[PDB]
Amino acid sequence: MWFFNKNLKVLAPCDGTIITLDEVEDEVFKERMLGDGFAINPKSNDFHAPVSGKLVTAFPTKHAFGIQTKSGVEILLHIGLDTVSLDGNGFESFVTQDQEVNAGDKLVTVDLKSVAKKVPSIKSPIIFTNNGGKTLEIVKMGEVKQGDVVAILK
Numbered sequence: 554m555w556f557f558n559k560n561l562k563v564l565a566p567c568d569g570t571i572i573t574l575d576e577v578e579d580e581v582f583k584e585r586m587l588g589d590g591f592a593i594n595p596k597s598n599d600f601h602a603p604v605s606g607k608l609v610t611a612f613p614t615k616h617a618f619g620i621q622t623k624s625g626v627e628i629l630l631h632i633g634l635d636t637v638s639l640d641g642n643g644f645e646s647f648v649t650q651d652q653e654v655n656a657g658d659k660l661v662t663v664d665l666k667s668v669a670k671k672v673p674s675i676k677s678p679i680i681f682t683n684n685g686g687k688t689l690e691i692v693k694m695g696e697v698k699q700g701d702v703v704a705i706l707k
Contacts, residue, residue, distance in 0.1 A: 561622065561686065561706035563603045563679070564656050565697045566630055569596035572676065572694075579634050582678045590628070590680035591692050591704065600632060600660050601699055603679060608652040608660075612637075615644035618660050619682070626706065627683040632663055633675040643668045657700050681706065 565571065572592050577583045582592070602620060609627065610619020616636035621627045632644075643664035648654060669675050681687075684706060692704040 562702050563704040565699050565701045565703045566600040566603050567595045567597040568699050570594040570696050571703055588680040588682045592676050592678045598663050598665050602654040602656050602658045604656045608648050611650035614641040615646040615661055629680045629682045632677045633672050635672040
């Protein structure tokens with residue numbers, strides 16, 4: 554239900570642990586330069602959409618996915634760290650830019666084992682590049698399953 558307010562539920566795109574941005578080894582992320590949110594220690598390979606919206610941001614390199622909900626708030630899923638460097642290697646995407654997706658849809662499949670050696674970190678950031686409703690009332694931390702609620706942007 555919705556009563557004088559609508560919130561945004563964010564799911565986990567893979568299996569693993571939700572950790573904080575401060576636990577991310579990258580100035581841009583850990584410092585929240587572009588926005589806030591959290592991260593994930595991918596246990597699984599499949600990364601799924603955290604919400605429903607338009608893949609407004611995608612790339613040939615397949616390492617980062619931008620989804621814009623009907624509300625305009627944009628959330629960015631960014632697999633690991635430095636992954637742009639890989640020129641799309643180990644990534645098998647299933648989406649294209651401008652595509653509309655449903656939360657829990659698969660975005661891509663990452664060769665985590667491979668990628669994990671090539672880059673500084675596979676810890677994957679989830680940031681809201683644009684909100685307004687800029688409050689994460691709750692971020693569920695700890696061990697999660699893909700498709701679990703993990704945060705509320707209320």
